[PDB]
Amino acid sequence: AFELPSLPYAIDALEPHISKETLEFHHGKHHNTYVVKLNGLIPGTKFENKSLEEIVSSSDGGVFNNAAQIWNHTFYWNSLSPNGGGAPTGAVADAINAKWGSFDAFKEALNDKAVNNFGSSWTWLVKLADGSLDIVNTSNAATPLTDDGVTPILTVDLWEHAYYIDYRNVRPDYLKGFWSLVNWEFANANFA
Amino acid sequence: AFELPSLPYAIDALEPHISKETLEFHHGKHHNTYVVKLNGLIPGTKFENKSLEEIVSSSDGGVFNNAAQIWNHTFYWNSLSPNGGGAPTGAVADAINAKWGSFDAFKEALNDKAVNNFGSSWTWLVKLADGSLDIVNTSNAATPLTDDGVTPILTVDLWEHAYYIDYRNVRPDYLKGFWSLVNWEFANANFA
Numbered sequence: 001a002f003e004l005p006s007l008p009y010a011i012d013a014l015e016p017h018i019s020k021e022t023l024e025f026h027h028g029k030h031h032n033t034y035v036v037k038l039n040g041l042i043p044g045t046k047f048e049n050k051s052l053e054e055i056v057s058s059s060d061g062g063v064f065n066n067a068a069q070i071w072n073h074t075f076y077w078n079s080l081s082p083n084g085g086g087a088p089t090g091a092v093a094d095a096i097n098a099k100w101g102s103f104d105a106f107k108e109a110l111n112d113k114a115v116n117n118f119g120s121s122w123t124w125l126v127k128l129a130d131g132s133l134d135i136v137n138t139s140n141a142a143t144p145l146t147d148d149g150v151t152p153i154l155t156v157d158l159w160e161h162a163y164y165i166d167y168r169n170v171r172p173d174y175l176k177g178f179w180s181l182v183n184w185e186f187a188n189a190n191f192a
Numbered sequence: 193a194f195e196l197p198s199l200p201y202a203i204d205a206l207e208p209h210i211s212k213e214t215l216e217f218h219h220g221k222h223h224n225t226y227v228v229k230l231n232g233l234i235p236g237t238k239f240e241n242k243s244l245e246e247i248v249s250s251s252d253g254g255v256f257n258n259a260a261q262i263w264n265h266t267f268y269w270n271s272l273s274p275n276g277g278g279a280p281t282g283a284v285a286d287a288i289n290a291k292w293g294s295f296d297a298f299k300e301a302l303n304d305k306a307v308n309n310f311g312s313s314w315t316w317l318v319k320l321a322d323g324s325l326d327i328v329n330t331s332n333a334a335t336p337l338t339d340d341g342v343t344p345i346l347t348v349d350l351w352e353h354a355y356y357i358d359y360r361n362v363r364p365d366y367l368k369g370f371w372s373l374v375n376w377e378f379a380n381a382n383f384a
C-alpha cells in the first residue's frame with residue numbers, strides 16, 4: 001500500500017512564503033487523501049502489484065487521478081525548500097540561459113504560463129528529448145511524467161488549495177512566494 | 193461593455209453557511225475579474241455587439257472561459273438565498289420525487305456527483321427535453337447552457353475558491369451549507 005511521504009522540511013520552514021496552515025492542509029489532508037483513495041481503488045485490479053510510476057503511466061479514470069496527484073504532490077514538495085529561492089545555479093542556470101537568454105526572461109515566461117493556467121492545474125519546467133528546457137502546463141492530474149522523452153525537473157501546484165489560504169485569488173503573489181522557495185538543487189538533480 | 197451584476201442579497205445574508213468574506217472575494221474579486229477579462233477581449237471583435245448568452249454559445253478559448261464563467265456565477269448567486277434551504281416546494285419538489293423517488297435520495301445523488309467532481313467544476317440540476325430532472329457535472333467553465341434540450345435550474349460552484357475560506361478541504365460541509373441556502377424559488381422559476 002502507498003504511504004504519504006514525510007514533508008522534507010518543518011511545517012513552518014517555508015514561512016512566510018507558504019504558511020504552516022497551508023502545509024498542514026495541503027500535505028496533511030489533500031496529499032493524504034489521494035494516498036488513501038488510491039489504496040482503496042487498487043486491490044482487485046492489475047495495479048496493486050505495481051509502482052506508483054507504473055500506475056500513472058498505465059491508468060485512467062479515478063486510478064490515474066489519485067495516483068498522478070500523489071506523484072505530482074511529492075514532486076511539488078521537493079521543488080520547494082527553506083534553502084531555495086533566488087538565482088538558479090549549476091547545470092540548470094546555464095540551461096535556463098541557453099533556452100531563454102536570461103533567468104529573468106525565463107521567470108516572466110513561467111509566470112505568464114502559470115497565471116494563465118485555467119482552473120486546477122500545474123505548470124512545469126521540463127527537459128525535452130533534445131536536451132533543452134521548456135515550460136508546459138497540465139490540467140487537473142495530468143503530468144509530464146507520462147510524456148515519453150520528457151523529464152520533469154520542477155513544478156508549481158496551481159490548484160487553488162495550494163495558495164488560497166495565504167494569497168486568496170492573487171496567483172502573482174503566490175508565485176513571488178514560489179520564487180523565494182524554488183529548490184535549484186532538486187532541479188539540478190533532475191536535470192543531470 | 194458587460195458589468196458585474198449586483199449580489200441579489202446583503203453580503204452577510206448567507207451567514208453562517210457562506211461567509212461575508214467568501215462573498216467579498218468570490219463575487220467582488222473572482223466574478224468581477226471574469227467581467228473585466230471579457231471586456232478586455234471583445235473590443236473590435238465579433239463579440240462586442242453580442243449578448244452574454246450569445247457569446248458563450250459561439251466562442252471557445254479565452255472568450256468562452258470568461259463569458260461562461262460570468263454566466264455560471266450569476267446563475268450560482270441566484271441559486272442561493274438567505275431565505276432558501278429546507279424542503280423543496282412546488283413543481284421542482286414533485287419533479288424531484290418523480291426522478292429520485294424522494295428528496296433525500298436526490299440530495300445523496302447530487303452530493304455524490306459534487307464531491308467526486310474532480311478539479312475545478314460545477315454540479316448542475318437540469319431539466320431535460322422530456323421534462324424530467326437530472327444531475328450533470330461540467331469542468332472548469334463548461335455549462336449546460338450550451339446543451340440543446342437542457343435547461344439549467346440550479347448549480348453549485350465546486351471551484352475551491354467557492355468554499356476554501358469557510359470549509360477548507362471538506363466539500364461535504366460546504367454541501368451542507370448549500371442545502372441550507374438552496375433557492376427553491378429560483379429553481380421553480382427556471383423549471384416553469
Ligand SMILES: OC[C@H]1O[C@H](O[C@H]2O[C@H](CO)[C@@H](O)[C@H](O)[C@H]2O)[C@H](O)[C@@H](O)[C@@H]1O
Binds near residue numbers: 061062310329330
Ligand atoms: O474518481 C472519480 C471519477 O473522477 C473523474 O470523474 C469525476 O470528475 C469529473 C471532472 O473531473 C466529472 O466530469 C465526473 O462526472 C466525475 O465523476 C474521472 O473522470 C472518473 O473516471 C472517475 O471515476
Ligand SMILES: OC[C@H]1O[C@H](O[C@H]2O[C@H](CO)[C@@H](O)[C@H](O)[C@H]2O)[C@H](O)[C@@H](O)[C@@H]1O
Binds near residue numbers: 119121138139
Ligand atoms: O484564456 C487564456 C487561455 O485559457 C486556456 O488556456 C490556458 O489554460 C489551459 C488550462 O485550462 C492551459 O492548458 C493552457 O496552457 C493555458 O494557456 C484556454 O484553453 C485557451 O484557449 C485560452 O487562450
Ligand SMILES: [Fe+3]
Binds near residue numbers: 073157
Ligand atoms: Fe495540490
Ligand SMILES: [Fe+3]
Binds near residue numbers: 218353354
Ligand atoms: Fe466560482
